[PDB]
Amino acid sequence: TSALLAGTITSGWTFGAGAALQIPFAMQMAYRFNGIGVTQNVLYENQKL
Amino acid sequence: NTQEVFAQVKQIYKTPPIKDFGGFNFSQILPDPSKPSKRSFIEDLLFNK
Amino acid sequence: SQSIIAYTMSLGAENSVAYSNNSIAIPTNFTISVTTEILP
Amino acid sequence: ASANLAATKMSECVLGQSKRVDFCGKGYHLMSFPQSAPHGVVFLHVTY
Amino acid sequence: ASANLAATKMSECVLGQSKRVDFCGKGYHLMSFPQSAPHGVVFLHVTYVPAQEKNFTTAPAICHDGKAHFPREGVFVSNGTHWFVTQRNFYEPQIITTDNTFVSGNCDVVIGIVNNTVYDPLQPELDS
């Protein structure tokens, strides 16, 4: 359970396909927001909220 | 049934000491290294309930 | 000189990947895999 | 069947981002965090 | 239940491309080929797997003249001296332009932003 958190927190959706992948967490949510029809702007503009 | 669920990975990942994730606090889900059993706060509640 | 042993199971190798606010890992090549799946 | 379902959620919800409605929580799924439990498992979904 | 699953995989994996993870093989699914067998069926799942990596320095945006430029489809990377844009799952670096980017707001609200130049293809034609 702890290993799968460290991969999701770090790599997001990559370690489930192959080798792990260093990605910052704030950048993962930018791609996940794009996965629901929302741009990267509202995240970085409201990163604290 | 456990291997198909929990053993979805092939290599153990771990978190860094510098937990900089853009303001997100995963302390209540990450393991407490002080306890004998390395399970998180939320995990410990479920094992007691 | 062989014998049967008993041990605690290991769950794979540790991998403490890199971390930073200014780091990214991008693939440069790729590898096609063709695995197999049986179902009765 | 519950175990095969949970194994499908760890692949779809945790290891990836699912566009399936109400499969990884009510709302637009962003990511999911698993937690262990006695004779079971618990998912902490995140939705927009 | 195993048969209903195989019927579900013949539809989602073979007859189409599935975005479901670990359902039609390990990795990003491209296509799958079925094969018969006694009292069952065999699926040959073709998958895309990135193999060779390379660490890079990144940033979420670029400050050009006060305007923050975000990428339309890709990420900003750096070889230590110059910044480019590239697709996520493959290193195809290319110059930052106003066509590869999107403008929203200013540079005083985004965290981790960096100052750099953005190219405008219209400018050199004016000098022609």
Coordinates of C-alpha atoms in Angstrom, one line a residue:
Chain A
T1 CA 0.0 0.0 0.0
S2 CA 2.9 2.4 0.8
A3 CA 4.7 1.5 -2.5
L4 CA 1.6 2.3 -4.6
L5 CA 1.3 5.7 -2.9
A6 CA 4.9 6.7 -3.6
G7 CA 4.4 5.9 -7.2
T8 CA 1.1 7.7 -7.6
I9 CA 2.3 10.7 -5.6
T10 CA 5.5 10.8 -7.7
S11 CA 4.8 9.2 -11.1
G12 CA 1.0 9.4 -11.3
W13 CA -0.1 7.0 -14.1
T14 CA 3.3 5.9 -15.4
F15 CA 4.6 3.3 -13.0
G16 CA 1.6 1.1 -13.8
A17 CA 2.8 0.9 -17.4
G18 CA 6.5 0.4 -17.0
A19 CA 9.5 2.0 -15.2
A20 CA 8.7 4.8 -12.8
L21 CA 8.9 8.4 -13.9
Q22 CA 9.9 11.5 -11.9
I23 CA 7.1 14.0 -12.2
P24 CA 6.3 16.8 -9.8
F25 CA 2.9 16.5 -8.0
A26 CA 1.6 19.9 -9.1
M27 CA 2.2 18.9 -12.7
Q28 CA 0.3 15.7 -12.3
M29 CA -2.9 17.5 -11.3
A30 CA -2.4 19.7 -14.4
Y31 CA -2.7 16.7 -16.6
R32 CA -5.5 15.2 -14.6
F33 CA -7.4 18.4 -14.9
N34 CA -6.9 18.2 -18.6
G35 CA -8.3 14.6 -18.4
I36 CA -11.7 16.1 -17.3
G37 CA -12.0 19.0 -19.7
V38 CA -10.3 21.6 -17.6
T39 CA -7.2 23.6 -18.5
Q40 CA -3.9 23.9 -16.6
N41 CA -4.7 27.5 -15.8
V42 CA -7.2 27.1 -12.9
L43 CA -4.8 24.8 -11.1
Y44 CA -1.7 27.0 -11.0
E45 CA -4.0 30.0 -10.5
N46 CA -5.6 28.2 -7.5
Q47 CA -2.8 25.9 -6.4
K48 CA -3.2 26.9 -2.8
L49 CA -7.0 26.6 -2.7
Chain B
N1 CA -7.3 -12.4 -3.9
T2 CA -4.7 -10.3 -2.1
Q3 CA -1.9 -10.7 -4.7
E4 CA -4.3 -9.6 -7.5
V5 CA -5.2 -6.5 -5.5
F6 CA -2.1 -5.4 -3.5
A7 CA 0.7 -7.0 -5.5
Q8 CA 0.0 -5.0 -8.7
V9 CA 3.6 -3.8 -8.7
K10 CA 7.0 -5.5 -9.3
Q11 CA 9.3 -3.2 -7.3
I12 CA 8.9 -1.3 -4.0
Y13 CA 8.9 2.5 -4.2
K14 CA 9.5 4.9 -1.3
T15 CA 9.0 8.6 -0.5
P16 CA 11.8 11.1 0.0
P17 CA 12.7 12.9 3.2
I18 CA 11.9 16.3 1.6
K19 CA 8.2 16.0 1.2
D20 CA 7.6 19.0 -1.1
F21 CA 4.3 18.3 -3.0
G22 CA 3.0 21.8 -3.6
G23 CA 1.1 22.2 -0.3
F24 CA -0.5 18.7 -0.1
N25 CA -0.1 16.9 3.2
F26 CA -0.1 13.1 2.9
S27 CA 0.9 12.5 6.5
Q28 CA -2.3 10.8 7.5
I29 CA -1.9 8.2 4.7
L30 CA 1.9 7.7 4.6
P31 CA 3.4 5.3 7.1
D32 CA 4.7 6.4 10.5
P33 CA 8.3 5.1 10.7
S34 CA 8.3 5.3 14.5
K35 CA 5.6 2.7 15.1
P36 CA 6.5 -1.0 15.2
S37 CA 4.0 -1.7 12.4
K38 CA 4.6 0.7 9.5
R39 CA 1.0 1.6 8.9
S40 CA -0.5 5.1 8.7
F41 CA -2.9 6.9 11.0
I42 CA -5.9 6.1 8.9
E43 CA -4.8 2.5 8.6
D44 CA -4.5 2.2 12.3
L45 CA -8.0 3.5 12.9
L46 CA -9.5 0.9 10.5
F47 CA -7.7 -2.0 12.2
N48 CA -9.1 -0.8 15.6
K49 CA -12.7 -0.3 14.3
Chain C
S1 CA 25.9 -29.3 -0.5
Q2 CA 22.2 -28.2 -1.0
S3 CA 19.3 -28.1 1.5
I4 CA 15.8 -26.8 2.0
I5 CA 15.6 -23.4 3.6
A6 CA 13.0 -21.1 5.2
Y7 CA 13.0 -17.4 5.1
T8 CA 10.8 -14.3 5.2
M9 CA 9.3 -13.3 1.8
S10 CA 10.6 -10.2 0.0
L11 CA 8.3 -7.9 -1.8
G12 CA 10.8 -6.8 -4.5
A13 CA 13.6 -4.3 -4.6
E14 CA 13.5 -0.8 -3.2
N15 CA 13.5 2.1 -5.7
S16 CA 13.7 5.6 -4.1
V17 CA 13.2 7.6 -7.3
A18 CA 14.5 11.1 -7.7
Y19 CA 12.5 14.1 -6.6
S20 CA 12.5 17.9 -7.2
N21 CA 10.2 20.8 -8.0
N22 CA 12.2 21.2 -11.2
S23 CA 12.7 17.6 -12.5
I24 CA 11.0 15.5 -15.2
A25 CA 11.8 12.1 -16.8
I26 CA 10.8 11.7 -20.5
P27 CA 11.2 8.5 -22.6
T28 CA 13.5 8.6 -25.6
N29 CA 12.8 5.2 -27.1
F30 CA 10.1 2.6 -26.8
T31 CA 9.7 -1.2 -26.7
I32 CA 6.7 -3.2 -28.0
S33 CA 5.6 -6.0 -25.7
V34 CA 3.2 -8.8 -26.7
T35 CA 2.1 -10.6 -23.6
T36 CA -0.4 -13.5 -23.2
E37 CA -3.7 -13.8 -21.4
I38 CA -5.7 -17.1 -21.0
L39 CA -9.3 -17.3 -20.0
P40 CA -11.5 -20.4 -19.8
Chain D
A1 CA -16.0 -10.9 -7.2
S2 CA -15.3 -8.2 -4.7
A3 CA -11.6 -8.9 -4.9
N4 CA -11.7 -8.9 -8.7
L5 CA -13.5 -5.6 -8.5
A6 CA -11.0 -4.1 -6.1
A7 CA -8.1 -5.3 -8.3
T8 CA -9.8 -3.5 -11.2
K9 CA -10.1 -0.3 -9.2
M10 CA -6.4 -0.3 -8.3
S11 CA -5.6 -0.5 -12.0
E12 CA -8.1 2.0 -13.2
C13 CA -8.5 4.4 -10.2
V14 CA -5.1 4.3 -8.5
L15 CA -2.7 3.3 -11.2
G16 CA -4.5 5.6 -13.7
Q17 CA -7.2 8.1 -14.4
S18 CA -10.6 6.7 -15.1
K19 CA -13.3 8.4 -17.2
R20 CA -15.9 5.9 -16.0
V21 CA -18.7 7.6 -14.0
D22 CA -19.0 6.7 -10.3
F23 CA -16.5 3.9 -10.6
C24 CA -13.8 5.8 -8.7
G25 CA -16.1 8.0 -6.6
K26 CA -18.9 10.5 -7.3
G27 CA -17.7 13.3 -9.6
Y28 CA -14.9 13.7 -12.1
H29 CA -12.1 11.4 -10.9
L30 CA -8.7 12.8 -10.5
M31 CA -6.7 10.2 -8.5
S32 CA -7.2 7.7 -5.8
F33 CA -5.2 6.6 -2.7
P34 CA -5.5 3.1 -1.3
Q35 CA -5.5 2.0 2.4
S36 CA -5.3 -1.4 3.9
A37 CA -7.9 -2.9 6.3
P38 CA -8.6 -6.2 8.0
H39 CA -9.7 -8.7 5.3
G40 CA -10.3 -5.9 2.9
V41 CA -9.1 -2.7 1.3
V42 CA -10.2 1.0 1.4
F43 CA -9.9 3.6 -1.4
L44 CA -9.6 7.4 -0.8
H45 CA -10.8 8.8 -4.1
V46 CA -10.3 12.4 -5.3
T47 CA -13.0 14.1 -7.4
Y48 CA -13.6 17.5 -9.0
Chain E
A1 CA -17.9 -14.8 -14.9
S2 CA -14.7 -15.7 -16.8
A3 CA -16.7 -16.0 -20.0
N4 CA -18.4 -12.7 -19.5
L5 CA -15.0 -11.1 -18.9
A6 CA -13.6 -12.7 -22.1
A7 CA -16.6 -11.4 -24.0
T8 CA -15.9 -8.0 -22.5
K9 CA -12.3 -8.1 -23.5
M10 CA -13.1 -9.2 -27.1
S11 CA -15.2 -6.0 -27.4
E12 CA -13.0 -3.5 -25.6
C13 CA -9.5 -4.8 -26.4
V14 CA -9.9 -6.4 -29.9
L15 CA -12.8 -4.6 -31.5
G16 CA -11.5 -1.3 -30.1
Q17 CA -8.8 0.6 -28.3
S18 CA -9.1 0.6 -24.5
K19 CA -7.9 3.4 -22.2
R20 CA -8.4 1.0 -19.2
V21 CA -5.2 0.1 -17.4
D22 CA -4.1 -3.5 -17.0
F23 CA -7.3 -4.7 -18.7
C24 CA -5.9 -5.3 -22.2
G25 CA -2.3 -6.0 -21.1
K26 CA 0.4 -4.3 -19.2
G27 CA 1.2 -0.8 -20.6
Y28 CA -0.5 1.5 -23.0
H29 CA -2.8 -0.7 -25.1
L30 CA -2.6 -0.5 -28.9
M31 CA -4.5 -3.6 -30.2
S32 CA -5.0 -7.3 -29.3
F33 CA -5.4 -10.5 -31.3
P34 CA -7.5 -13.4 -30.2
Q35 CA -6.6 -17.1 -30.4
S36 CA -8.8 -20.1 -29.8
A37 CA -8.0 -23.0 -27.4
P38 CA -9.7 -26.0 -25.8
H39 CA -12.6 -24.7 -23.6
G40 CA -11.2 -21.2 -23.7
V41 CA -9.5 -18.4 -25.5
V42 CA -6.1 -16.7 -25.6
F43 CA -5.5 -12.9 -26.1
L44 CA -2.3 -11.5 -27.5
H45 CA -2.2 -8.0 -26.1
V46 CA 0.1 -5.6 -27.9
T47 CA 1.2 -2.7 -25.7
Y48 CA 3.4 0.4 -25.9
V49 CA 6.1 0.6 -23.2
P50 CA 8.6 3.4 -22.8
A51 CA 12.0 2.0 -22.2
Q52 CA 14.9 4.6 -22.2
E53 CA 14.5 7.6 -20.0
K54 CA 16.5 10.8 -19.5
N55 CA 16.3 13.3 -16.6
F56 CA 15.4 16.8 -17.5
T57 CA 14.6 20.1 -15.8
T58 CA 11.0 21.3 -16.2
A59 CA 8.8 24.2 -15.3
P60 CA 5.0 24.8 -15.5
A61 CA 5.0 28.1 -17.4
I62 CA 7.1 30.8 -19.1
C63 CA 7.2 34.5 -18.5
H64 CA 7.9 36.3 -21.8
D65 CA 6.9 40.0 -21.3
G66 CA 4.7 39.7 -18.3
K67 CA 2.4 37.2 -19.8
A68 CA 2.5 33.6 -18.6
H69 CA 2.6 31.1 -21.4
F70 CA 1.3 27.6 -20.7
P71 CA 1.7 24.6 -23.1
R72 CA -1.2 23.5 -25.3
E73 CA -0.2 19.9 -25.5
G74 CA 3.1 18.9 -23.8
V75 CA 5.6 19.9 -21.2
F76 CA 8.5 22.4 -20.9
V77 CA 11.9 20.8 -20.5
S78 CA 15.5 22.0 -20.4
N79 CA 18.9 20.7 -21.4
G80 CA 20.5 23.1 -18.8
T81 CA 20.8 26.0 -21.3
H82 CA 17.7 26.1 -23.6
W83 CA 14.0 25.3 -23.1
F84 CA 11.8 23.4 -25.5
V85 CA 8.4 21.7 -25.7
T86 CA 7.9 18.0 -26.2
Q87 CA 5.2 15.4 -26.1
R88 CA 5.0 13.7 -22.7
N89 CA 5.6 10.0 -23.6
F90 CA 8.4 10.7 -26.2
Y91 CA 11.3 13.2 -26.4
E92 CA 10.5 15.3 -29.5
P93 CA 11.9 18.7 -28.5
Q94 CA 10.9 21.7 -30.5
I95 CA 11.0 25.5 -30.1
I96 CA 8.6 27.4 -27.9
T97 CA 6.2 29.4 -30.0
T98 CA 2.8 31.1 -29.7
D99 CA 1.3 28.2 -31.6
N100 CA 2.6 25.6 -29.1
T101 CA 1.4 27.6 -26.1
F102 CA -1.5 29.3 -24.4
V103 CA -1.6 32.6 -22.6
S104 CA -3.5 33.2 -19.4
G105 CA -2.9 35.8 -16.8
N106 CA 0.5 37.2 -15.6
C107 CA 3.6 35.9 -13.9
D108 CA 2.9 37.0 -10.3
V109 CA 0.6 34.1 -9.4
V110 CA 2.1 30.8 -10.7
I111 CA 4.6 28.9 -8.6
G112 CA 7.8 27.7 -10.1
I113 CA 7.5 29.9 -13.2
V114 CA 10.7 30.9 -15.1
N115 CA 11.6 33.8 -17.4
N116 CA 12.4 33.0 -21.0
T117 CA 11.7 33.9 -24.6
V118 CA 8.8 33.0 -26.8
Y119 CA 9.1 33.0 -30.6
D120 CA 6.6 34.7 -32.9
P121 CA 6.6 33.4 -36.5
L122 CA 5.0 36.7 -37.7
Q123 CA 7.9 38.9 -36.8
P124 CA 10.5 37.9 -39.5
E125 CA 8.0 38.4 -42.2
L126 CA 7.6 42.0 -41.2
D127 CA 11.3 42.5 -41.7
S128 CA 11.1 40.9 -45.2

